[PDB]
Amino acid sequence: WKFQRYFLVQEYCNRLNIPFPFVVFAYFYMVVKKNETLAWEGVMKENYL
Amino acid sequence: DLVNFIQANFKDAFGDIQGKYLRLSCDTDSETLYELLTQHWHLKTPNLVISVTRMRKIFSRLIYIAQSKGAWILTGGTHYGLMKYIGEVVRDNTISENIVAIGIAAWGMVSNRDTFSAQYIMLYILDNNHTHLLLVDNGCHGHPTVEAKLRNQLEKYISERTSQDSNYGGKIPIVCFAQGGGRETLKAINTSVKSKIPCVVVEGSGQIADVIASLVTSSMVKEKLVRFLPRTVSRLPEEEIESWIKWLKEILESSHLLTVIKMEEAGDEIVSNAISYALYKAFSTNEQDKDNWNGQLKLLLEWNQLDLASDEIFTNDRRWESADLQEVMFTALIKDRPKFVRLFLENGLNLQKFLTNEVLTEL
């Protein structure tokens, strides 16, 4: 179930937010138009080792 | 502003690389430079770690202890050796309150020197991790190891300079640690032990550190280091061998200022425990504040060590004051020392009397 949850999020993340009737218009408009973290991760890995 | 003061101090060849790189004159007052740096260059520290240059684990633990205490970490800053590893570890820790690194590397060694913010990318080159870099040159490119004298003078002045914080009789510890078997390191050790500076060395893997650790006359020294330093013995002439014997005899004269840590022990946090024991031995040797039991208790308590502390003073049995740690226990509660207030309660104090209304309100 948790896994399945992700999918829906991803789907609704792909379409962002848009009401259905404005969603159709937005789809038509789109069709017309169409480092430090790594260092911290390394330090955490050293701590884990 | 600062450039004018720097130029006037020498009475130039100074530039900021970007922490702060400065060139100093040998015939200068270390006290004045230290005072100026404290006033403007950086803040003040209670503790200053002195570096004289499994092992990586010990060095990392020492770095963590220094960062937690906020102590300054003096080092040579040489690119080749443990200095680069220490700089990398310091950078990694700072990536994750503030750690400050000091490099003592004479300008003569550097082969790429330029006179606002000069940029260098890459002999005797050095690591750029260290925030502050002081280079003491004799005025010629003769590659002399004369910066050690200025380093020792600055350390002696800093020890003389009283610091109210961190107790220790209003003094600074100036902990000294060496792991490399160099003749210059031996001379620095002799000079430091001549002073009140305490030096602690772990057995680890050192050309001379192992010899001194095992040690703790000419024939005795000849037997020692025979296998530890074969190349050094072969290269060193007779005069050098006699000088080695003299330096080591002078160093071994004082056992209070010399601390030996065995590499076989697998105890946790031993890096700080050894330093604490050495500092306590030096403080006991001082004999000025040793009369005041509370004073030594403050320094002992501020550090991790508690087991030896209990025997040293908490054992006592001569005459314990009824008030006992009237403020020491209060500081322990404020300091939040775990498994240490337990001893205050074991010896015992009036909990109601100890926790006065004013004291409770202040807490």
Radius of gyration of chain A: 20 Å
Oligomer: part of a larger assembly
- How many DSSP-defined strands of chain A? 0
Overall structural class of chain A, as computed from helix and strand content, comes to mainly alpha
Termini separation of chain A (Å)?
33 Å
Largest sheet descriptor of chain A: none
The secondary-structure element order of chain A is HHH
Discrete helix count of chain A:
3
PDB class: membrane protein
Keywords: trpm8, menthol receptor, cold receptor, PI(4, 5)P2, cooling agonists, temperature sensing, ion channel, sensory transduction, transient receptor potential ion channel, TRPM8 activation, TRPM8 inhibition, TRPM8 desensitization, TRPM8 antagonists
Entry title: Cryo-EM structure of the mouse TRPM8 channel in complex with Ca2+ in the absence of PI(4,5)P2
Chains A, B: Transient receptor potential cation channel subfamily M member 8
Overview of this protein structure:
This is part of a larger assembly, with two copies of chain A. Chain A is mostly helical and 49 residues long. Chain A is built from three helices and no strands. The first copy, chain A, has helices at 2-14, 20-33, 36-48. The first copy, chain A, is elongated. The first copy, chain A, starts with a helix and ends with a helix. The A-B interface holds A 36, 39-40, 42-43 and B 92-93, 95-96.
Search tags:
part of a larger assembly; 2 chains; 49 residues; mainly alpha; 82% helix; elongated; Transient receptor potential cation channel subfamily M member 8 (chain A)
